Amino acid sequence: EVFNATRFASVYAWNRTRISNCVADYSVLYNFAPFFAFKCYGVSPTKL
Amino acid sequence: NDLCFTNVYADSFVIKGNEVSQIAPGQTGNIADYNYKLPDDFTGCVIAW
Amino acid sequence: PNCYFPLQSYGFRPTYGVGHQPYRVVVLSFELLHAPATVCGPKKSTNL
Amino acid sequence: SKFGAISSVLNDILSRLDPPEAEVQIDRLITGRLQSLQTYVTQQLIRAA
Ligand SMILES: *[C@@H]1O[C@H](CO)[C@@H](O[C@@H]2O[C@H](CO)[C@@H](O)[C@H](O)[C@@H]2O)[C@H](O)[C@H]1NC(C)=O
Ligand SMILES: *[C@@H]1O[C@H](CO)[C@@H](O)[C@H](O)[C@H]1NC(C)=O
To answer: Which domain of life does this protein belong to (chain D)?
Structure first.
């Protein structure tokens, strides 16, 4: 639902959502976007 | 142009734009984990066009 | 159902964004280890 | 002591970062702990003398 939205809020008032009490499998993230910049800082995407 | 190499290897394949950043030693992705992965101590060059 | 093919088609079309364009990748792997070498660049053979 | 790295736990930083990016923080921890051990053995040599 976060990546399926159509009206992403503006950067002046950036929409912020909380994700908890679930299982994070980033395959849906990988296949839900033609990534242009995946610059991770605190955690490597490999073991994510 | 001033070095010496024991043996040179050239692997030619076609991947996507995000896969260009994906192809690197020890990286993420189904491609980098099941199709082709470079060694962690890779010593060479990667050419993408 | 629950029996998926290991490899799926990597289809293409000329109308793709940069994240989906048909990028051609060639890698050049060397071994900078102590062994009789086989390839060099420009050379001179001044007498020892 | 984090020693200027992501974390001071070797196992946690290994499980949170890939080898070919985590080895930098690994070297940071290596050199910090190694300098600490060198200081300890130098002070112990002073005390033993
Ligand atoms: C940020 O974008 C979220 C996208 O999922 C919004 O969550 C949705 O909000 C609608 C109501 O607008 C709910 O019906 C839906 O179930 C989901 O929770 C979220 O509201 C939005 N936040 C802001 C501040 O725009
Ligand atoms: C969600 O994404 C899919 C594919 O990316 C798209 O076909 C669909 O229209 C999207 N849904 C909404 C509500 O935007």
So the answer is: Viruses
